[PDB]
Each structure stands twice: as C-alpha cells, then as structure tokens.
C-alpha cells in the first residue's frame, strides 16, 4: 500500500520511525496521492519541507522547488545531499559551466537530478523556458512546489513582483500537482495565494493551529484599576507561586513600549517584593548580556523588556507574559505572549489595555508607515499594518473567547478553550468591566 512505502522511505532515507505529528503525516499522504494541489502553513521547526521532499522521491519524475532567495535554498540542498538524495540548485550565483552542466542534465531522458531548487528570477528567464518545455513534453515533471508562497500577496509583509509570474507557470504545468508552503498567512493572504498561483479546487489545506490549551488569556483595563503597579505584582505572585514549597518557581516577562516605562516598572515591581530588572537598547551591550544571564539562570525571576527581547532567547518555564502596553499587532502579541509555557505547564498571558495606550501606538504606527512611504511610495501592506493593530484593539474592546479571537485573525477553527480565558471562565464579569470602561467613554 502507499502507507507501507511512505513509512519505509521515511525510515530508509530520512531516518525517522514515525512522523512528528499526524498533521505532518496527513499533508505528506495528500501530496503523494497527487490528485489535488496542496497548501501547507506550518511554523518554523515543524518539518514542513518533508511534506514535498519525501513525496518527490516516491514519484516517477522531477520535483521543481521555487524558493525566493539562495540563503534559504542552500540550507535544504546541503541536508538533502547528506541523505544521499540526488538534488541540484539553479541560480544566477552560479558559473556558466555549472549552469550549463545542469541545463544539459535536465535535457536527458532520465536526468541525474530528482529535486531541482530554483529562484523565481531563473524560473522566468528566457534561458530556462525551453528546458522546462522539454521537461513537460517528456512527462518528467511530477510536482511544482512554491516555498514562501505568502510572497505573492501584497497584504503579506514580504511582497515580491517576481512571484506574480508563478501563476502563469502553474497554468503551463497543468498536468502536475502544485504544493505551496509558508509559516505566515492571514485568511486574506491564503485567498491571494490560491488565486494568484492559480491553485486548483479542491485545494487541500494543512495549517498548524495557534491554540495552546495551557495558556490563560485575559485583559485588564488600567483605567478601572486603583493600583495598576500593585495589580501586576499580584499577577506575577499568582503565576510564580504554583509550587509554594520551592518558594518562587519559574520566571516571567513584562513588555513595555518605552525604556523609561521599563526602568520605572522594574523599580515599582522590585519595591513591592518581586525582583525585576530592565532590558532595553539604552543599556550598554554588557548590561544587557548580564541582565539576560540573571533571568536565564533564575537569579532574577522577572525581566521588563522593550520589543528588543532576544529572538535566540527561549526559556521553558516562563510562568507569565504581561503586556503593560498593547503591542503594534495581533501577530506581535501572539508571538510575544507565546514565549510563555513552552514546558506545557499552566502559564498566564495578560494585556493591560488603556485607550490612551491605544492612541499613542495607533499614531506611532501611522508615523513610521509615513516615513516608509516617503522612501518607497505606496503599498497595500501599509493598510495591512494598520489592520494588524485594529485586530488587537478589537481583541481588548469586545466580549468573546480570547483564544477564539486570536484563531479568527490567523484563520484557524474555533479552538477548545476549557475555561482557558477570562470570558470563557466568567462571561458576566467581563461584561461588567467592559460596561465600566464605556462609562468613562461618555463625553
């Protein structure tokens, strides 16, 4: 059966005895059957690549993989080579001799090349059209793959005019199933992907959900709070106190927009008896490395940071993530809040919302969009930037499951919140606080 082959090739070539996840498996099987175009939207470290690489080995012919830049392309080729897989890369960073060695290999009946990584520039160039023409005619194309598929959308962050030719490409390669992959797609970006690449219905979709059961999402209104600083300390004390025998157990992050706010919030927290240190661009590199160190090694349980917080920094027992100030985007909030509870254990994610904060950020977004518009003219992404903020304001100012609002933005199914946010745990108490906010709104 096909399962017997796929399991076997997974083991013999790639080395694994079972797939990471049954979603990775399902995607993989759907590409193998080859009746449908496929969209795979999984985050970094999911093994999204396996879902087109493994099926490529099990087919009769060649798999063209279109990736936007060679840095990306190169990583894959080296690893595939190490697995003793017959891979090749066609780019304009290559000598005429290497280029022509490869163009030649492709014009063979039964080429050496099983998988061909190619840049969009090259996949459109006159130099390649005839090679492609011969490959289709000899029925040697098993699959067209488009990586970083989101680049085709003007509503995505990384638009490339290059990618607009890919739809015409897909059309010519009609007989061949098309796979498109990315980590990052709003529903609007997914609709742009399916349209612009001319994917064919039914498009089968494999999309890792945002939802993490062990995170508890809630919003507090700084306007309706006598001791904001004191509220925060209690939130930190709850979160850090889930093993009283150890005393303080775990660590937490407080996120601020400004450096002044960091320094101040660190001092306020420290006084009320929760040891906290400020991390921002203001400090010397040495102070930063020392503060990061103290947090990582649990000397100091709480770090107060600007957007500067390290990408390479991933800790396992982050018991809470407090946004003192609303973030620039729903995506930013998801990512920053999502640094919590990577060890699977219960964690708390809290947004401190003020309309004054909303207004300060709202404006700063529009200012830095204006500064980009003077340097490169208009872009439909500028509209996306503003709507990315609206979605987070809407998260704060509506009644409804917090996890569900996050899922609607990203395009997931309604998640299984087990009284896992404020609204699901007590709907009426949320209505109370929302009503209370609207009383200040009068006039």
């Amino acid at each position, epitope marked *: 059966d096909p399962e017997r082959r796929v399991r076997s090739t997974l083991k013999k070539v790639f080395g694994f005895d079972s797939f990471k996840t*049954p*979603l990775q498996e*399902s995607a993989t099987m759907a590409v193998v059957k080859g009746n449908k175009d496929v*969209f795979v939207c999984m985050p970094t470290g999911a093994g999204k690549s396996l879902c087109y690489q493994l099926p490529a080995l099990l087919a009769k012919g060649i798999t063209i993989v279109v990736s936007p830049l060679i840095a990306l392309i190169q990583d894959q080729v080296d690893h595939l080579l190490t697995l003793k897989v017959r891979v090749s890369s066609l780019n304009s960073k290559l000598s005429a001799q290497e280029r022509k060695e490869l163009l030649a290999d492709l014009e063979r009946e039964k080429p050496q090349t099983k998988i061909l990584y190619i840049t969009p520039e090259m996949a459109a160039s006159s130099s390649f059209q005839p090679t492609l023409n011969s490959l289709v005619s000899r029925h040697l194309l098993s699959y067209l793959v488009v990586d970083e598929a989101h680049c085709v959308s003007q509503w995505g962050h990384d638009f490339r005019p290059d990618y607009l030719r890919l739809g015409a490409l897909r059309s010519r390669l009609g007989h061949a199933p098309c796979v498109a992959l990315t980590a990052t797609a709003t*529903p609007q970006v*997914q*609709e742009d992907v*399916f349209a612009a690449l001319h994917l064919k*219905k*039914p*498009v*089968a*979709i*494999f*999309k*890792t*959900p945002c*939802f993490r059961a062990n995170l508890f999402y809630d919003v507090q209104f700084k306007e309706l709070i006598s001791d904001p600083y004191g509220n925060l300390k209690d939130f930190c004390l709850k979160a850090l106190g889930q093993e009283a025998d150890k005393g303080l157990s775990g660590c937490g992050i407080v996120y601020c927009r400004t450096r002044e706010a960091c320094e101040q919030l660190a001092i306020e927290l420290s006084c009320r008896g929760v040891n906290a240190k400020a991390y921002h661009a203001g400090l010397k590199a040495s102070e930063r490395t020392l503060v990061q160190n103290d947090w990582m090694e649990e000397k100091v349980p709480v770090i107060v940071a600007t957007i500067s917080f390290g990408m390479g920094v991933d800790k396992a027992n982050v018991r809470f993530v407090a946004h003192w100030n609303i973030a620039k985007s729903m995506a930013g909030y998801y990512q920053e809040s999502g640094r919590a509870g990577r060890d699977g254990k219960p964690s708390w994610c809290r947004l401190y919302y003020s309309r004054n904060d909303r207004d300060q950020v709202s404006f700063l977004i529009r200012k830095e969009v204006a500064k980009l518009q003077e340097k490169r003219g208009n872009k439909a992404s500028d509209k996306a930037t503003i709507m990315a903020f609206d979605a987070l304001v809407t998260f704060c100012e509506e009644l409804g499951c917090r996890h569900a609002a996050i899922a609607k933005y990203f*395009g*997931d*199914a*309604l*998640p*299984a919140c087990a009284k896992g946010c404020d609204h699901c745990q007590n709907p009426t108490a949320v209505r109370r606080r929302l009503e209370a906010l609207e009383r200040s709104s009068s006039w």
Partner: nanobody, 124 residues
Framework: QVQLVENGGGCVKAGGSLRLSCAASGSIFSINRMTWYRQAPGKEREWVAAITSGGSTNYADSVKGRFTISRDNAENTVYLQMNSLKPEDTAVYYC???????????????????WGQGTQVMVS
C-alpha cells in the same frame, strides 16, 4: 465535504411573497461569494442576486427592489426575500458557495466551490 440545502419555496399567487433559506453544513470558516441562481424549466440558468463575505450585495435587473438577500453570519445561512412575485419568477432556486474555506481544529481543511440541491417555487 459541505452541504448546501435550500428551503422555503412553495406555490403562491402573483403579487404574493416567499422567503428562501439556504443552510450551509460542515466546518465552514468563510465563503467568498454566496449567489442565488434560478432555473425556469426550458430556459437557461439565471443569476438572481449575490452577497460577498462582508455583506456587499448585487441583484439582477429583472428582480431589483422586489428581491433582497442577507446573511445570518452566526448561522452561515443566507436568505432571499422575494416580494411582488410574477409568473416569470417560477423556477427551481439554488445557491453557489464560491470560495468556501473549510477547516477542522486538527488543522486539516479544504477550499472549494459548492452547489445546492434547490427548492421548487411556483407562481400562478
């Protein structure tokens, strides 16, 4: 897969009124365009009216002001209010679910077009 099942047809007299309901089943997240077509026997399929996700609506000239469509967003269901009916309007009425995004919490979905079963509408 997805079910479109239309309801709320029957026989009524000229000048009378019906309201059709089309119900969409399955894990539907969104529908790009929901569209009302009618098939009069021995005539070509006729485009009636349609509504975008976000509630933009347009209407055939032959039914403008008499007919109006709307969407129970909660229900993933559309309605076609037909008042001032005429013998012309006698037909089978069905819906097209263009750009129908479906998705389970597993992360496994589809994106497809779907067609309805139809409801009979007689105008004396």
């Amino acid at each position: 897969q997805v079910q479109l099942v239309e309801n709320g047809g029957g026989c009524v007299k000229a000048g009378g009124s019906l309201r059709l309901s089309c119900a969409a089943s399955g894990s539907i997240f969104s529908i790009n365009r929901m569209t009302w077509y009618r098939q009069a026997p021995g005539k070509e399929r006729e485009w009636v009216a349609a509504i975008t996700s976000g509630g933009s609506t347009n209407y055939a000239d032959s039914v403008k002001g008499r007919f109006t469509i709307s969407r129970d967003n909660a229900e993933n269901t559309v309605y076609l209010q037909m008042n001032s009916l005429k013998p012309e309007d006698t037909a089978v009425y069905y819906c097209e679910a263009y750009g129908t995004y479906t998705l389970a919490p597993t992360g496994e979905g589809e994106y497809d077009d779907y067609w309805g079963q139809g409801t009979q509408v007689m105008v004396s």
